[PDB]
Swiss-Prot record, chains A, B:
Organism classification: Bacteria, Bacillati, Bacillota, Clostridia, Eubacteriales
Span covered, complete protein: 2 to 438 of 1297
Native species: Clostridium botulinum
Recorded coiled-coil stretches: none
Record's protein name: Botulinum neurotoxin G light chain
Record remark on domains: Has protease activity.
Subcellular localization(s) per the UniProt record: Secreted; Host cytoplasm, Host cytosol
Record-listed Zn(2+) binding positions: H211, H215, E244
Task of the protein: Has proteolytic activity. After translocation into the eukaryotic host cytosol acts as a zinc endopeptidase that cleaves synaptobrevins-1, -2 and -3 (also called VAMP1, VAMP2 and VAMP3). Hydrolyzes the '81-Ala-|-Ala-82' bond of VAMP2, and probably also the equivalent 'Ala-|-Ala' sites in VAMP1 and VAMP3. Has low activity on A.californica synaptobrevin and none on D.melanogaster synaptobrevin or cellubrevin, have a slightly different sequence.
Active site: E212
Amino acid sequence: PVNIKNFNYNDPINNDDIIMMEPFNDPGPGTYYKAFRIIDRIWIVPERFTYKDVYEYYDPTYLKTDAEKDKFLKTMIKLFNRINSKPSGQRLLDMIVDAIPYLGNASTPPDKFAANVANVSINKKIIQPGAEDQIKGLMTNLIIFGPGPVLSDNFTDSMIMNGHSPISEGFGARMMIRFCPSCLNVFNNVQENKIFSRRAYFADPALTLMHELIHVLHGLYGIKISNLPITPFMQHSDPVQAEELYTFGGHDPSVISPSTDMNIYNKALQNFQDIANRLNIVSSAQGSGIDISLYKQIYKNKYDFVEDPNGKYSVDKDKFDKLYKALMFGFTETNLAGEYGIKTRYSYFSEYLPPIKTEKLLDNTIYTQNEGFNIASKNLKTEFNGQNKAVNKEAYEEISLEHLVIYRIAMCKP
Amino acid sequence: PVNIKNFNYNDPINNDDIIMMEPFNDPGPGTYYKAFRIIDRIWIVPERFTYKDVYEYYDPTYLKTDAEKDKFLKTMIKLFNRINSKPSGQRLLDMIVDAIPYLGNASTPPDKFAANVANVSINKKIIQPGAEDQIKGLMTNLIIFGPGPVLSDNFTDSMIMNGHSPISEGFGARMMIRFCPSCLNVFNNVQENKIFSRRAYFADPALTLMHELIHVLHGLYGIKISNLPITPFMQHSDPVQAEELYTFGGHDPSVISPSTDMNIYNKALQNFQDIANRLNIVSSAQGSGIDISLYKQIYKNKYDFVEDPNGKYSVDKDKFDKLYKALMFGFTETNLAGEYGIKTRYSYFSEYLPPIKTEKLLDNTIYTQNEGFNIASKNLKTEFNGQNKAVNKEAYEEISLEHLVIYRIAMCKP
Ligand SMILES: [Zn+2]
Ligand SMILES: [Zn+2]
């Protein structure tokens, strides 16, 4: 299991695991932020991200003081510690750490490694007293920010290139998440009065995190692949994306057809073969310092390629099949919920109610690494009572209308 | 199997199976229409109903001439003949004919039958030459209109009462459909090039009809029951209604929870028990002509009640279970599609593409009772090629932008 490092927000810059970084590529002089490497290749940036019915949670004041940055940082670490408490989440974190993006993309020459590209590298600033600060490239797998203007809208992405998309073509891409750990999704369950009624529950934010991490993993493997578009009417994407459904509950035959399964399977396979074909012709790097054979070995390990006695890489069908299934159907939100004794929504189509806030995720009488909210010593384990809005009221507070912007779905002229 | 009668639009009023009827209850003097009883308790009224992305089909000119009324009428009959060609659709039609609404509703005294209520009776006008025309009550199960302003929007309903809703409380209610037989839904299938691509298909309008008929049946049994509302935010209905999903494909465990299944089961059972309790105390009718024991027998047969040696009705659990399952899980769009060799959408969540028009449903070289579009002698049976937009082009025509209003889904202030 991966090591997870503790930090205080005010711990000094050391240019190693506490740094100034510029993660959005450059207007030349861009904005640098204080970042914390809690796990290899995984950084927390405790700052706001600035670069039927629906509830947007606003809070302009979230993450403005150093005290609150520190709380965000500590909460993120606690959540990773939680994920790290059980073998499945441990495996999730090991696989992310290992899933280094390919040194290149569709526009890099196939016979080269190129680290100096936006899907691979950000700017890091080496802070030295007495001399001018140097700007150095830095490779990462995952950067976690705080939220943009809307807190209730956790979201994972890349910066995608001119034309092509590395996260869907096997190259993969360094991943960024916007996250609010203290903002809890709320859902329903129709439940038998130990008469039937709707019982309201709130998310365990570690499972919320694990969900985005699944996406991260798919993106890093370059297999975040879209369903065919719906193209003639005006071209547009399928409302029901198979990778989204996979991330929630693996196969979903009643919603995703076996043909759609197969199409995505075949495109992931072709993506891996493309990477193997590239590896067989890479003979140098665009810049200096890149040791080719070392990175060939890393990618062989990441994509689980076979290597013949001449050094040629190929995709083995059994090895691909086992790795694909792990990535698409092994790590799902509902598998992990079950492993962790966490209640989640019944289905991908269940609606969210208005979100709620907790200030108590660092309080071990309320939320623990090993049990989350569902603490057996308080009788909150049974029926996931610790996530039950009617039972575990001390865990959370409702969000006022001063924070909450409400919309209704309408049909309008395009 | 039910008899289905042939008619011409211009066949004269005979006050029996060709009548003037006023199906929306009264501004006093309301509007009367020429209606055709093709099956017992089932009437065709060939007139317009006046009382991600989205495509509304307008055609103000549809159903204005007598020639086109006649075509609508003949097409409706052909579609019922199609449904009537196989044992499952035969059973569907027999069950509708037999599922007379209860003579009353929540506001009628439990100890009476009341035929003169809006869920039961419409006005019929007896046309006699020489004398003033008499207005008489008329009980029906199903009235099929032409479309309202939007053709692309087939829809089934009642006129629901002040307060209560008979279609969800066991009483049931006479049902009305707005239907456009010649307006075809279009859907996709991701398909293996006998490379993967999206193949466009069009609906068989008989399966489209069968779908609404399922709803009709549920409504007539008083078991068109809503999921619990989502109530505190502002109260509203569940986007994913279990009866809608049942109508499409029966159980759907990945979407509908076993608790939601059970809640709806229990409420249907209670609805039947309420009807049985009423039957045990009905001793007269509000008006004249209603023979109580005859209608008690009809309802015993409809709801499959047991009768004890004292004349008391009760609900038998095995009999309810078998009837419930038939109504909710036996008659589904996907069961019937399979029985009829009709292609439909892969799931309830699949999106519709812009609709298309056929003028050829009365042409037996293109659409038949026994095979629909999928005619083996033209090699249109294999892979449902007769519903394939790319293969069976002669079957249909695309709808112009002069007819087609386009909307996009937006999030707006409520
Ligand atoms: Zn997701
Ligand atoms: Zn329906």
